[PDB]
Design a protein around this ligand. Sequence first.
Ligand SMILES: N[C@@H](CCC(=O)N[C@@H](CS[C@H](O)N(O)c1ccc(Br)cc1)C(=O)NCC(=O)O)C(=O)O
Ligand SMILES: N[C@@H](CCC(=O)N[C@@H](CS)C(=O)NCC(=O)O)C(=O)O
Ligand SMILES: [Zn+2]
Ligand SMILES: [Zn+2]
Ligand SMILES: [Zn+2]
Ligand SMILES: [Zn+2]
Lengths: 260, 260
Amino acid sequence: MKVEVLPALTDNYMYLVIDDETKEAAIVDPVQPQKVVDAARKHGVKLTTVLTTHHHWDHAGGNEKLVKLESGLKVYGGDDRIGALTHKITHLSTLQVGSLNVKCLATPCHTSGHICYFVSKPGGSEPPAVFTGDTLFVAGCGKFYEGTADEMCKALLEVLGRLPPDTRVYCGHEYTINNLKFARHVEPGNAAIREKLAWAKEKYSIGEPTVPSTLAEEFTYNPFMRVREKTVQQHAGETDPVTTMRAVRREKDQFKMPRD
Amino acid sequence: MKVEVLPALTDNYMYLVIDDETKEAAIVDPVQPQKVVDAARKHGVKLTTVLTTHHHWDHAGGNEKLVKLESGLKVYGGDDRIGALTHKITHLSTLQVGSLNVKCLATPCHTSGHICYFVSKPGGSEPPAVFTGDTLFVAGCGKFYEGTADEMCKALLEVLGRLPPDTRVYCGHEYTINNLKFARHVEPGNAAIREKLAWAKEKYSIGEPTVPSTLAEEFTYNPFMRVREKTVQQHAGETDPVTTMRAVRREKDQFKMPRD
Ligand SMILES: N[C@@H](CCC(=O)N[C@@H](CS[C@H](O)N(O)c1ccc(Br)cc1)C(=O)NCC(=O)O)C(=O)O
Ligand SMILES: N[C@@H](CCC(=O)N[C@@H](CS)C(=O)NCC(=O)O)C(=O)O
Ligand SMILES: [Zn+2]
Ligand SMILES: [Zn+2]
Ligand SMILES: [Zn+2]
Ligand SMILES: [Zn+2]
């Protein structure tokens, strides 16, 4: 399995997911379709499938155009608002991309039809990957546009959180530096936050993406994944994960980003 | 002048303003009209005038009923949505209650037609009074239902804030304890806030209202009157009074009130 990161717009990421065995490929959130076709031609792969994390235009807005550029595509998604949808899927729906297995995970909160895609190789030895859209970012999470704090706790701690620790996390946006500046405010004594922030500023300087991260890493530095940690609860002034999540998300929504 | 504080509903205040010379009186926000009639009869005065701060039902909901209990009343207000008006007034309109002088002050924000009434006795032998409805509370301010942060800054800092410092403040609700708990979160080092908080808890225990306060006192402990102070700006992460007002009011809107 190979994953190519394709920057789009100002700070979005699309992902070309290649099956090494058949050379069949999938594209996650193809908002700039000519870049998708250029990348598939560069790697000599056959695009067969579109995996759409949610209906927001910055993720699904290129679907109509892509199905006119390329024929025979199967467009997957969990919401009727998604453009050019052909296969409506739900929690635990499965499909194949060549030899790769894909499992759809419903993570409603940022939008009510959000789906994360868990991709693996049955019987293989390589680590799996999870395409998290605007549910889980590197050191952050999506704004709660169509959902509650309880729903984000379920998505992060029970659905994504119970996946293998070595799972590679490939999110919707390049928000890593600002997410870690907020994390550093929540937990001033956490060294993993500080070292990941120095690493992210170096990657931004050389023009390289900050994805993927891993689920084990998210549990060390992401305040929203750490709502069961006493430091985060004490910062929020709460004693359970749901009220803590609600408080930390409201605080980040109003936070002024420092310039360093 | 004599001001009789009359509790109404759950936490509203109505105010009987008596001219001791002529025995004539005005009533501010007469939501429970029979209580108003008994008080006037108890004090041996003739009700002549209604001063309405704004149209919300908890302030103006008794106006039409009151004019059916007592004939010949002059009912003042700055909004056509107020029931039973006889005299529509605006910024700097003047009138008399017996020998007392009344000046209307337009303070649009909580509602577009909100008016505060500044009452003074010719001479200077007693401190004046201002009836502020839901614009200025003891240690707080009204929600911005029909206005902006800039309008609340003008209402508090220029219109009300330029009145004599000894002016007594008679506001629409008994919100003082909760207002001071929020103020303590904004400025945890401010001694006037914690001292007023402890005093307000004692007044609540013995059943005495926390009104009137004075304009001088509000400048020491009200976070909305203190948007020009460096401590309040630092809490909000802002460097000017308008953006600070907007941030502090948004924060109070979703603030979880502590138990002590
Ligand atoms: N353009 C915005 C970007 C900032 C923003 O709010 N980003 C979203 C993901 S994108 C997004 O959600 N979106 O573009 C969108 C598109 C269509 C609709 Br309808 C609603 C939203 C988010 O969840 N951020 C995480 C955080 O702040 O911690 C701004 O005004 O700064
Ligand atoms: N959640 C509030 C709602 C009450 C409310 O909206 N009160 C109006 C006055 S009728 C207001 O402007 N309150 C000022 C504030 O919330 O600071 C409570 O019960 O304390
Ligand atoms: Zn989105
Ligand atoms: Zn997005
Ligand atoms: Zn009101
Ligand atoms: Zn009110």
